[model samples]
Target chain A: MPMQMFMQVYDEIQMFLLEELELKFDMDPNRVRYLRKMMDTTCLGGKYNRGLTVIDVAESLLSLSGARRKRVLHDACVCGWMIEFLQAHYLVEDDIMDNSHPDVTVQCAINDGLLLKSWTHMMAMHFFADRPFLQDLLCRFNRVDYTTAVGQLYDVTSMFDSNDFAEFTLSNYKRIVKYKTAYYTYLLPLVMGLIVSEALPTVDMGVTEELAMLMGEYFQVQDDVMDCFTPPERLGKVGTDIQDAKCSWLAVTFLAKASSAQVAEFKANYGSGDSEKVATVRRLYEEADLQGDYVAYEAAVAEQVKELIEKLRLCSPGFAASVETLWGKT
Target chain B: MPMQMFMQVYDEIQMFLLEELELKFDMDPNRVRYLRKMMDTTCLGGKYNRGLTVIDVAESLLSLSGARRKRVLHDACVCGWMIEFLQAHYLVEDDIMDNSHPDVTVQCAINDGLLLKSWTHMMAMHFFADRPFLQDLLCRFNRVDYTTAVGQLYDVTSMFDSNDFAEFTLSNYKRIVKYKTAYYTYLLPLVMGLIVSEALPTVDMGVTEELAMLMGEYFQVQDDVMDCFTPPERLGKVGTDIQDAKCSWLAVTFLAKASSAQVAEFKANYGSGDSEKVATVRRLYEEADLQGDYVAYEAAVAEQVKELIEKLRLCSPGFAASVETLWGKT
Candidate 1:
């Protein structure tokens, strides 16, 4: 019933997005038709991982029950969907940056991103107009949105710098992953859910930021590794981070460890946007032992997050519950 | 004190933008340097028309006294700056659509637009978190942001359609101006000012929409005419809407009234991005009596808005005051 309740809100929002579109695109409903597919694929494509994570985090943190607790749950569900919209917006922007649009034009993608963010704001106002924590929730988005954009800026520029790899240091790559990936994907949903429950203060971040950043960075590293190594069957789409000239964790690690000749070969082949050139970079990753390095690094990040979970439980069980849900659980 | 109070918020938000960028772009502070120029030009270039009107509307509608009244003025000032940031973001996106990026790269423009929007959200939450209308203020932005983006989308596509004047209908042109220009520039500041005063219901739009649309449309028709008719010395920048293939009011009118010879010649010359070609379109505009038509239309719109303002005094003195100040007074 709780899951059903959460999903009912999704239906409500999907209809809201559709209705909002239907009004404007009356003259050009093909845009509406294209958007139906775009929203479905970009938004509904995920398994509600972060979106559902939000629900669990809220329920775990809230001490209240009865009517008050139910409201918290409902609000958390809404917040989760809001994050999904934000993620959908980011996906559009990222795709535009990567030149990864065959389904839609770049202009459509840009406008689509703007529209998705508009929905995220709309949800906050329409759902939480009377709530006390409404402002906190919005500022939370403002902070995250800014961080994510900076990360994206770094990522896009780093893609263009494949010829030199001057800005592809671990320090820079971590900033990109931490901002672009970890904060929005992992840290945000948990923090927002925590905020909705009023478990954290209206001002400041503590254990949640540390824990979520670790988890989020770990998750994106996993994403980067999977993009290169995972079979197309598992991912459903072939990874193009190399061809797209992404400033990914694997590329950073490979550059950190490569010989001068290996570096030159990798530089020439990587970001070439050719299948054969892509294979050359893939071969370089294998030769550079990037697979082994990635697995070891992945293990370390997981260990670190799990340790934080253990430490956080001693300090704050509610926050421990917040971070504790997504570690290989769902 | 009141004027000083409004400018103080502008200082605070501008510093916030600078500070936020400083943290991220410490290594590459050239971005920080570029954005300083970007923000100052896009945001501070305009006179405080909407911002000051917001201040006036709030004062007019508010029945509060002493400290309570003072706070409303402060909040309205913040709201005004928020709208300004929204305008700045819109400017960047509009530039991107027009492919007008001599100052910054498209990548920078896209990210820069995103940063402007983030500041807008930050302003709301930072300044008005505890206020009752916080959610309402945010929702107001969401609606305006979406409408503006849609308006921009229409404007961009209309430019691409310079090959044929297929989509350049008067009805469509009005929709673009109403959404893009009228709502954000004229209507929004007034509505937000009214909201801060709680002079209108959070749920609706009636007289304000009608008046703002009329005034906003009038302002944009003036803008359309100015782009062609205004001298570069006065405008300080050359107008390229004709060469850029903008489906402006003048374009729509000419298409509706043109003879076959004029239509063929104008289509061949307009949107060619050549000065010689642009001159041909300009000659056609002159021949079509568009300047005279526009002047007549401008006078009609102004008179109609005055009529609305006069009628509005009976219904809402505050709103009438809000509309009246902008017409002839400073």
Candidate 2:
């Protein structure tokens, strides 16, 4: 039933964007076609977990039937789509900042991304105009965007700096991941769900944020681990963390564990973008037992989150379920 | 007095952005410094007429003195800085998307731009939380952003398309300018000043929008004319409209008047970015009496706007003065 609702929200979001583009462009078919193509290729390409979490949490919190239920579900779905749109917008700009080749034609992608960003705000004002805390919700969402952008700036600078190896410390890695990944990926979705559920004021914001950050850190560390160990097809793209000199968990962990000579080897091979150099960096990671460290780290985070969920389960089951959704994926 | 207020707003905006950056990245002095530098170079570098217009219009409308006047000025100044922030953000991203070399470093510019964008909305929400039309104001501001972005999309794609010459019609030029330049440049500042003055609902939006758009179109045409006739030192940048094959007023007017032979010459010389070819295009423009045409066009627009001001004078002296601000600059 949740999956069915999620699909409905997704479809409605697609329709909302299409209709908006049409109205804004005065039904200019060419522009509408291009925007729709972009919406499908980027916004719809995501896993929809973030979008679905909104509906799932809303369903768990709100008990209504008939038109009211439909109305609330529709609102939740719009918020869900807002999340999706925000993510897509960030990724498009992030791709350009990282000098990565994006899927959409680069020429119009930035403007389209801006359109998506504005739409998120527009939708919020439209759906929650009557809510008492509408301003607070909007400000919080905008804060998340700014924080995520700062995190991106940190990540890009660290990767591009000449002494990249030295920059990839464990502390720096955590900071980067927290800002760039955790807030938007974990906290935003949960908080958005809370707002949609009308539970934001009642919930423990401090504890909720802490839990979400922990989950986000875990998710990103897992991503780093998979980058090196997971096959290209499974990952859907060849691992470039080593070649890109990303301040990834694996790289930072490897730095923490490597000896002077091993560090020298890393300095030589890291960020080369050559296959052989990447393999050498991978070998160093393997030698340092980085994969084993990742396993241990994931296990610890999973247990910690499970305990936290239990702790908060009574006060905010929607929040607890949201965390469990990530836990279940793990 | 207006110039002095503009300067005050400019300095305060710089300080506000700097303080915000310091708070956001307290742990990283280098990053904060970099961001401050970027903000100063881009946001503070502009002519700031858009920024000033907010205060200019606000002061004319409000009759308060002492503390209330100070308070209104503070709020209007914030709105003015918001315009500056929005402009800088757009320029930064627009530069990257257009493959232009923006003054600030590209990697973090987009994120910083996003930061500025969010702050504009956040500031509005904070300041106008008590107002009855707060939601309407926010929605309108967001719509302006989306429209501007769509206009940018239209622009960048046209420049990148294969048949670059075919896209330079007068109607297409007007549409692009209306969306990209006029909305933010003219309508936004006027409307923002209105909102600050609590005159939004009272004002005839149709008449206000029409007047602002007319001024915006005139401003852009002036800009296009300046691109060709203004020397590199005076204009502050080399005239690349000819080399860039931009859909400028000069190019469009030339298209309107050119013979088949002149059209062939334009196709050969435009967008080359070479000095010799650019010179040839300028010579052709001279031959077409484009300079004389620009003078006539400017006079005609000035007269039209004067009549508009006269019509609006009794109802809204603030709006009339705002229109005259652009008129004086021309």
Candidate 3:
């Protein structure tokens, strides 16, 4: 469950993948070398929270020790990294084809993103084919992949339409986050570990999805809030939702209640390129108490999710604790 | 099946897909509207040779009529379009991220391509889950997807490098075409049809792959020749390999034998940005009999592939005819 163990599995899986590529291409040693460099740069250097989530969830659902524990842990790590792999694929694509930054050759990024996705299936088939829920795992990966794309479609189209606020709403925001962020980030990894440990029959997965979605929605909203309120250095990466004209939670929230004049002020300042314009938008949010309101909203939703998790704890044992750990932390 | 029947199935599949999208997004009809347009634009307008190939292969491998056969055909068409679905995904990606042309908003294209791929898994899981080789079909799709991306990586990296004749070789050409073109176009469809008909046990899928690879490699070289020798009016699409500095068959063949002075001439004219420079390259090709040489080489490979089909004819019944019909034609 630790980062060290999870990373150990990741390194092992990387070797398996490179060797697979190497075997497929004796005609091109040079190709393998290029791919080695690609795998290193593309798949590494992240907090790996998405990946580690699966491992933690699996640990909660399984009971073993020594080699037995290590065995499930190793397999669960693969499942965990499958989430990581999926995210890497998403990141690689959005990194090139984003609302913001867009390279490493569009060709390389596209193909490399593809390879990252293929590894999800590759490792699943090779590593987890003997497991009970192979079909379930594969189908979920594909469904999540497609659904995630649908979410991105919503994400991209909703951007830069400062001309119209008709498309921006809390409902649309929920739809976007549920599909884009929640399912892949929470549902996929949780379900992956659940399936890997053959824990589905015993656990209530329907509510797992509900809680995952709720958490994911909250998680994205948390991100939206951090982008606006948290210091840029504290975040390590600057948030550009305002400048990018993203249909963010803040926009959805404040727009719902702001006065006509306030809406005008928000429109002029929001999505404007000038730094002072961005600052002016921030002051308006301060004046409107958007941050304070969202904070109370976050806590209320957290309590609601906790209440639901409390019901699951009676049956699922460790599952509640695993999910609860990530509730506020992630 | 005729084009009418095949398209009947395509229309049905399209409806199924749109309804699926509609169900997923009651909150955003506008999103579905955008996606409907996207699906229409991204999935249509091709000859649909890849999709139709599976249907043909299924007909060859199966024995049926009336509702039973139609049922199989319905499912096979889904399988067939899965190939087309994959191609659609590949086309959308390369359209935006090519060695030649690259857009449709990199974000939309990226996610749309991912959606196309997601449909492959969706259709397979939904339609083929009851079939025997469902797992096989899914794995091949993923493998071909990754392999195709590898070929594209080879393609994009190989471009505009007239200085580095080092990476440009017939071996690399085979590797590129086999991975990029053959497996998906030939192996996947043929195997798909065979799988759908439940004919895999009787059929020699081992040579099916070899023959598929051979045909695909020939197909690419054939296109390379057509790009150079065929008229723009006849070809419909103009060839840009020389101007784009593509590591094409013609380049690989001619480079292997062209004199030092000829290479210097090629280096001067190839990949240049002038109509006259293209004409000079064409003249050099004429002087070297590159067109005539490639034509003969293509014919010989076709003969070899046909001979292989002859041996397969002894075992596979109508399967040989199915593959043979497209041998020189596609």
Candidate 4:
């Protein structure tokens, strides 16, 4: 049932893009094709979990009659799709920034530009124009975007600054994850759903933030672990984390446990595209029992989140359910 | 007096950047320094005519009491500075897209991110939040930005699509200028000033748009002409239109007038970074009497703009003066 609702929302958002590009802007057919291609490639490529969370939470919170419920659901979906659009731009630009691909940058930029304009257009007209907390919501989203960009810069710079082992601390990793991944991936969608449902003032922000940060860290650590262990087909893309010289969880955790000689070996072998070097780095990680450490860490975070969800259930069942939806998936 | 006001706006914008980074965001000192440096390099480096035009028109339109004048001026400056911020991001990203410099892209991204946040913050708080046309103004700006980005895409693609001279028609040039340069450079500041002065409803958008479009084309033509003729120091950067294979005004015009052999020469010599090739293109332009043509073209555009200014003067004297200020500069 939820999947059906999510699909409906996706269709509506796609229709909105077409109408805006064609009827409103009077954009050329070729340009429209380009825009549509980008929308499909980037926006729909995601799992839609973040967007689905918005719909789920909205349904849990709003108990209006038939027509009003439909209206609220539509608005919630618009917000959900906006989150997806935002993520698409981030991925496209981050890919360009990583120098993973050059041809994609221009297309990503055009898509980002359209998404920005459309997001503001929706905010100004469709969803929250006259709402009491309209400006506050916009401000919150803007702040989150700014924070994510800063986190992206931090992540990018640290990737290149790998020669300095001091820069690869676990705290730095957490900070990067919190800003780049956690806030936008978890907190933003949750807060956006709350705002759309008019439940923001009713929710406990401090608790929500703590839960989001915890979930975000767990999510990123899993990504790092999976990058090494998961098959290219299962992971969706071949793992380039090692070649890209990313500040991954495994690297930071292994750095914490490695001796000086191991550190020297890592500095030599890490970030090379050659399979041998990547395999050597993986061997070092195994020697340090990084996978075992990840298992222990994942269990600890899961337990902590479960306890938090129980606490949240006492105060806000809808919010707790949303978190559980995310928690279960990860 | 206008120069002094522009300087004041520049200082305020710089101060705003510092406060937003250091106090509000609590960014690390190194990151703050990185952002500030990018701001100074990109934002402060421009002529700031678009920004100054906002201040100029605002002053002409608003006839307020002492305290109100001060308040309005502050708001106008904020709007003016926002234009500068927007331009900085465009130039930075465009530079990256052109592959002119690689190191600058991340800093530019960070700067662009902060500017987006700060612009929204100011719009939500310092300027238009409680205004009657708040949403309208936001939507207009959003639309303008989308148009500009589309224009940018058209431009970047055309630079590479140089083999097809048919794509570089005068109509295409005008379209790019209108979307890429005119809307933001002329129409935006005019509309921004009108909105700030609460005179949006009184003015004729049709006339304003026409006048702005005319001026925008004139401005860009002058830019293209200046690239080959002006000294690098005077222009503030080395002109790369020839080397970069731009579908510039001069190139398009030359193509239209050139004989078959001249066209062959242009196809061979244009877009070479080599000075001798650049010189050959320049010699061809001169042999075709392009400089003489430019003189006549400038006078013709100036006459059209002057007539439009007179028409605008009868309806909105402030708007006319702002237009004249820009006209005088180019």
Candidate 5:
């Protein structure tokens, strides 16, 4: 994507955050200024390629002229911007609560320089309310907000005690990804695209929503795989999913099938602050042939969602292309 | 009023809090349960007397009977309940940020526990959205939430700074009260009451809102006076506002007019934790002949609002009674 398209998205998100919503944080003016800067930079940093792809896909389906295509493109960019904003909100709060460092390339919300957790949430609420189709938007927004919160709560609570000598199940890991990662990254963007297309006639746009959520879950599994091995420069933070002892897809899959002694070893060093523990876990994963399992599971879920998407007559070819573009960028 | 009347009000408020809207905290389940209990109790604790008073006032003007009267009474109680809910949301967040103790009758939100600060706000947004008139209620709710946050921000930022050292002023004190106490307490209840009665349309509601805000300012000044000298039992906590080093109306008024030496002493010791510092400042207020100022400010403002209420004749008697009932409770 061109740099200016990304900048436009960033500027619109900032206007929503600062001007239209006018969120007031309790932190000092300097810190609030920095928080604003953090938001701007984070929005700008993301590849605007997926967003542009969404518009390109939508535009191909529409029989509209140039001006109308531009409008659709602008709205698609806004949806893209919202995705980043939603992610930033979660990251900022998570870093503070988790005591993580340099969240999204800036200080955490409650670290030495800033402490405005309440204001952050209020701003998020205002952001959701600013949309024109408010009732349905808020209903979905509330669920997204609640689901994300549940994911964080699960992470924090599970930290105190995460030992399963019992066979690993897909249930717990699925819940975590569904709540924490899927809704924002996958469902939000697609459902927002549906909203822009005026495809959701009633508030209860049932099957489309189910398909989006399933695709989102598929996307999150891919994310878990990427995070462990993605380059540090591209991802900013390094192996956070591992360092944080998160109950991610790979770990759960490994635990489910590993032998008793191996499982015992995994539990013993799970979140120990040593880098050696992470290395040892990686070793254990290889010994258990987890990479093979991950690849198989990823392929199965991806195929299932693609089949479901194809079954939906409402799924325009252009929308499918947009979905493809999203995956390509990912 | 019968106890059942209070129970009914509580039930209606619960419709807003739990039924029509559902919000849950992301902390420990027990912590969430406790916070919900406190919210329920604080809102239900006050006698339905204030709420009933609104109904009584309305009856003298509007000639509704049976179900209509019951509906009107229910709405009146709802307005009262909205005030309580708004106050609870503020206290929950403020307690966490301020480390306050003994909010209402139980431990403060943060002191009682940590994770509830933002959850209650989510609850408030949900509650407001569920109302039939979502935008009108949400706007009022947002205004109250933002104003109180700004008020608390000012309070924390300037708490220990010298009041007499050219930084703090009476104008600043009034500004804080207008936001912190006025919007939720006075303006919201009356504005909502008028809206329900259809006596004041949205377009012209601003005038009555300003008038009610002025009344709230006066009421808060009286509260500050009560905080300074009212018995510990009457105010609930012992030396409550003083112990917190609050910039009450008494302190600000005294500083504005005190002699230079007295002002210096006030500056040096006012917000210091030492009992001697507090007692010394208390003694200087006696010397400054300012014990009577708050009492005088209260009486004068009450008179002005009463006259303004009478002069503004657009409102029906039922709507007018709502504003009158706020003071009637006092």
Candidate 6:
């Protein structure tokens, strides 16, 4: 019933877009439709994992409080969906600006099928603005948005500049990921749940927020590593970060390792939009041994994350378990 | 004191943009500085005429008890500035797409000196998201944004293959102006003031909203006429609607009066970016006697507006007088 209600809200959002808002995107109708469909499908396609995580934590925290359970579950689910929708928003825009060809098995912006994707992404933000808890949520959402824009601004502007790349150290990469991806995805759902359940002060959500953000950064790093080496089917189109000239950690680390000749080749050949040039850059990654370095880094991050998870367990078993299940999937 | 307070809020908004939000603009350093200057300069330049219009109406409707007077003034000013900012937002984006230059007498987005103007505009929206009474104000703002987007989308899309110049009726122009320019500039301020002052019932705002919207459309048609004939120094830049390929009422009426040869000349030369083509299109305007047409249309709109002002005088005398002053400048 809760899932049904949630789906109804989702449908209502679409109606609001088409009927109420009246955005007559005529440039590429198929692309607009596809983008809207992508938002809807991506929002619903997932297992509602993060939302359930919130509920699990809340149930234990309010275990003896029977009357608040259902309302908490409903609100938690909504917050969870909001986090997911926020992810879709950033991903769609990044896909457009970075020119990612396919996003999760669907056509991307500027591709043969998708266009006007940015407008759809913006309307999605408007959709979220209509919620009952939008003010509290927008406060957090806008913070994450501002942080991500800064990260993207850094990523885009630093590209193709050797001096900028030199300054792009490991700490900088971590800061980018923490600000860009972690807060909205990993911490927001829990924070929202805590706020709704009125369990924030009791649980020390600030510490939890920081810890979860670190875990999210570690997760993104793992994903970045996978992007380079993982197959196209799993990794989604041959490691787009370098192809897009994104100042991603994977590309930064590769730059850090590349020899003078390799760096020269990269500078000449990178983002040329030719298959051979893309392949040459990919080969340079092997020469730089980025794949091997990622393997080692992944193991180290996992150990550190384990230590943090243990510390979290000591704080509150329920919250710790919820986070454990979330990370346990990877 | 009231004026000082309004200026202080406006200044604080500028500081917020420059110090906090501008820091997030990363792509082109020069563009960031340019947009900062542009936003602040234009924001401060407006005459606060619409704001005074709102206060005029609210004073007649409400008792001006305690903070009510100050709140109405502050909110009306904020709404007026918000309207201006929204126009700036669209202008920045339009400059990028339309390749326009000289926004409020400065460079466009394509110039390296103004690359990140759109990003700064988005940041401004985010800044507004955090203000007091933001929810109510943003709801009004969003409605204005969506309406303007709808109008723009229609204008852009309808221009490509719209062959039925015969169908370019005055009613269509009025509809476009109401949606594109009127709601945001005129009705928005009035409703914003009413909502803030708690003078009118929220549900009943629609009654006054529609009436104010008609008045706003007439104001925009006056603007369109001014764009055609107003001196470059008086209006800032030679008529932009033609250069920008906008489907203004003046253009429609001119085409309606053109002969077959003139229409052929317009079709071949009007919207092309070439200077010779633009001049050819303008020549047809003179050949078709549009100067006389513009003068006649302007008078008819003024007479109708004068009648409306008389009607509003009985109910809201101050509001009618203020609106009269706004149009009197024409």
Instruction: Please write out the lDDT profile of model 3 over residues A175-246, one tens digit for every residue.
Output: 889877888888888777777677777778777888998898778888998998899899878878888778
* Predicted candidate 2 versus true structure: per-residue lDDT over A193-257, tens digit per residue: 77766677767777777787788888889888888889999999877777767788988888777
Candidate 2 per-residue lDDT, tens place, B6-108, comes to: 6776666666555765775433767666766766777776688888888887887785216657767767777787788788888777567655321226666
Quick one: best TM-score, which candidate? 3
Clashing pairs in 5: A168-A256
* Order of the predicted models by TM-score, top scorer first: 3, 2, 4, 1, 5, 6
Better of 4 and 5 by lDDT: 4
- Tens-digit lDDT string for candidate 1 (A152-197): 6677666442115788888888778778777888888878887788
In model 5 chain A, the worst 10-residue window by lDDT is A100-109
- Candidate 5 per-residue lDDT over residues A150-238, each given as its tens digit: 55545444443321323234675666666666666666666666665555542334544565566666766677777776777886667
- Please identify model 3 stretches exceeding 4 Å from their true place: A64-68, A98-104, A159-163, B25-27, B64-68, B98-104, B159-163
Best by DockQ: 3
Per-model i-RMS: 7.3, 6.1, 6.0, 6.1, 11.0, 11.3
Model 3 vs. true fold: TM: 0.94
Tell me the tens digit of each residue's lDDT in model 4 across B1-330. Answer: 766777776676666656676776546677666666666777786678888888888888774217767766766777777777777766656555545213435544633644553454454343555666555665566667767876776666564421156677788888888877999989999898887777887777888999888889988998998888798999977888888777888899999999999899999998777889999998988898988888898789889888878877777776777778877876
lDDT of 5 at A230: 70
What residue pairs are clashing in model 1? Answer: none
DockQ of predicted model 6:
0.16
Q: Which ten residues in a row have the lowest lDDT in candidate 6 chain A?
A: A100-109
Q: Best-fitting candidate, measured by lDDT?
A: 3
Q: Each prediction's TM-score against the native?
A: 0.80, 0.90, 0.94, 0.88, 0.75, 0.72
| Runs of candidate 5 exceeding 4 Å displacement | A1-6, A9-87, A98-135, A158-169, A202-207, A222-235, A238-245, A261-286, A313-315, B1-6, B9-86, B99-132, B159-167, B202-207, B226-234, B238-247
